[PDB]
Amino acid sequence: QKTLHIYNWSDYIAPDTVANFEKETGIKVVYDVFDSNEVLEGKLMAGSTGFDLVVPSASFLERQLTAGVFQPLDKSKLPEWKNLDPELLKLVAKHDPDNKFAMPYMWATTGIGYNVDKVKAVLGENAPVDSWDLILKPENLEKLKSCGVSFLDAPEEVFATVLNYLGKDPNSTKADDYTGPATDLLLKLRPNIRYFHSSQYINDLANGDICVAIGWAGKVWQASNRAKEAKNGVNVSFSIPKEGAMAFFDVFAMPADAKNKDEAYQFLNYLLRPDVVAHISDHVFYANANKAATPLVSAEVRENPGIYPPADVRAKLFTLKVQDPKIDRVRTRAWTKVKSG
Ligand SMILES: COCCOC[C@H](C)N
Ligand SMILES: COCCOC[C@H](C)N
């Protein structure tokens, strides 16, 4: 009896993906979920994960490669690799040289999810929902405080976002940028922030418990879809702000101690099927990295520029670089100071 252990982001797969793979291959898949790059990186660094496939963000995989926690993907076992978008493969190759270790799965941006009616009730019809001013300007957050503010629990994404908003290098290597202006702004906003979390804002946006959130595009679009299905009158939307935003690329990778390698390769080839990953995008509201799958994606997802952004928007996006030990320590210490309590 063949088995396969998969550790993937939560809400990152169609409800029937695994069942169809199981019935076609006869493999029993053990499936578990996470919502934090930090949780996954911690597991990879502390010892055996017990998984055959894991799905870190590409900028995190770059750090993890130097620890040897993955084994390189045998491209002769991934024949439809050519389905992947070349330009996106080129971009991930900055994190994963020669695309030796990482199979791009989905990608999206870290933007602003918001209740349309609540935000407009508080900040007016012309609320700057096109700008990080909506949530990074203290005077706006003080008014939104009453209706609920949520920051994502991803310190590298938040600090890069703040640095870009402050006109500085999103991957600044100047320590004073973090301890000074970045911390200053985050400490002004902190009293208005209800909580830091990477998943709860989905349901809180859907049910109307919060009105604004720094979050990932697909997660916010899922909340907007759940509110629509519940017919609760809640109107959630997502914004890639005009000042730019962080893009991320989540990639499948194979731990160096994976037990069921053959099964894991069968699962990766299953995900390379254009119809397979297009069907996933239809349910999770994330853009996949498969260029052959794009015309198979539903028009609701494919034509949403908050999911498949056009060249105008993509040119203003930035990606995370891996910081040195000093900046990493200073950023981690400031995050702790910000999440205090
Ligand atoms: C064609 O998709 C990949 C384009 O991403 C460009 C980055 C987000 N700046
Ligand atoms: C000590 O248990 C955790 C309690 O957290 C809330 C306070 C504000 N830190």
Author numbering: 29 to 369
From the publication, what sentences describe this entry?
Here, we present a fluorescence-based, genetically encoded AGM biosensor, consisting of an AGM binding-domain derived from the putrescine periplasmic binding-protein (PBP) PotF from *E. coli* fused to a super-folder circularly permuted GFP (sfcpGFP). In the sensor the large conformational change of the PBP upon ligand binding is transmitted to the fluorescent protein by altering the chromophore environment and thus triggering a change in signal. We chose PotF due to its promiscuous binding of biogenic amines characterized in prior studies. Previously, we identified AGM as a natural ligand (K_D_ = 0.22 µM) for the periplasmic binding-protein PotF.
Additionally, we aimed to generate a non-binding control sensor to validate that changes in fluorescence are solely triggered by ligand binding. To achieve this, we introduced the mutation D247K strategically located in the first responding region of the protein to ligand encounter. By introducing a lysine at this position, we masked the primary amine binding-site in PotF generating a sensor that is incapable of binding any of the tested polyamines. The control receptor module PotF-D247K showed no apparent binding to all tested polyamines in ITC ([Fig figs3]). Furthermore, the crystal structure confirmed that the amine of the newly introduced lysine 247 occupies the primary amine binding-site of the PotF pocket and, thereby, blocks ligand binding as expected ([Fig fig2]). The D247K mutation occupies the primary amine binding site, where typically all characterized ligands of PotF bind in the same fashion. The crystal structure displays a nearly fully closed conformation which could explain the good signal of the control sensor. For the control sensor, only a small increase in fluorescence intensity at very high AGM concentrations was observable in the dose-response measurements, which corresponds to a K_D_ of 3.6 mM ([Fig fig3], [Table tbls3]).
